Structures are given as C-alpha cells and as structure tokens.
Amino acid sequence: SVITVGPYLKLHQCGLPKKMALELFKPFVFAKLQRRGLATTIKAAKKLVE
C-alpha cells in the first residue's frame, strides 16, 4: 500500500484498508460464516462476500 501518517492511533496498533482486510483474512471470514451458520457452503459465502 502507500503509507500515511495517522496521529489518532496508539503505538501498539496500526491502520489497515477495508478491502485489504477482506482479501487477506478471507478464509477466517469463511470459517466465521460457517460457524455462525449464515452460509451453508463456501461458494454461497464467497458470493455473499463479493
């Protein structure tokens, strides 16, 4: 990505874009959607994500 200074955050945390967080943690999103029961298969969960 491109770095950008942000003063309203602590030194133990950092910022992250939402689309990058969706594309990086996508199997964890699939596992959480399987555990919560809102999507039966991974194909329906992926279609609900996109």
Binding site: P27, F30, Q34, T40, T41, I42, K43
Partner: protein, 66 residues
C-alpha cells in the same frame, strides 16, 4: 465414471465425470444420504476447492479419518 474412494476418509466415495466433481456419503449398507456437485473451474482456487469437499464431507454426517 466409476465410484472411487477419496482415501482421506473411511465413509464417503466420489466420482469424476470430466471437469465436475460429485460425492456421495454412504453408511455400512451402501445407501446414499446426500449428493451434490462442485465446479473446479468456477472457483479458480485449488486449496479452496480442497476445503469445499473437506467441509461438505464434514457437515453432512461424514466420518473423519482413522
């Protein structure tokens, strides 16, 4: 084609009729409970296509490995 075992589980056995995949879980009597189909070209990912079958053979009463 003919039904070939996955050899990752002891319960279910599947087949391959080209670019599509189908599976069918079975009890000791050989009766099929559920049966679906999956498309590998529609997914576009190999470990996601592995996890699809590994979850379909998990939630539908599938026996795990020995």
């Amino acid at each position: 084609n003919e039904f070939t075992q996955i050899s990752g589980y002891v319960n279910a056995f599947g087949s391959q009729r080209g670019s599509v995949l189908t599976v069918k879980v079975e009890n000791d009597e050989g009766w099929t409970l559920v049966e679906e189909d999956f498309d590998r070209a529609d997914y576009g990912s190999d470990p996601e296509f592995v996890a699809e079958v590994s979850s379909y053979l998990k939630r539908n009463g599938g026996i795990k490995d020995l």
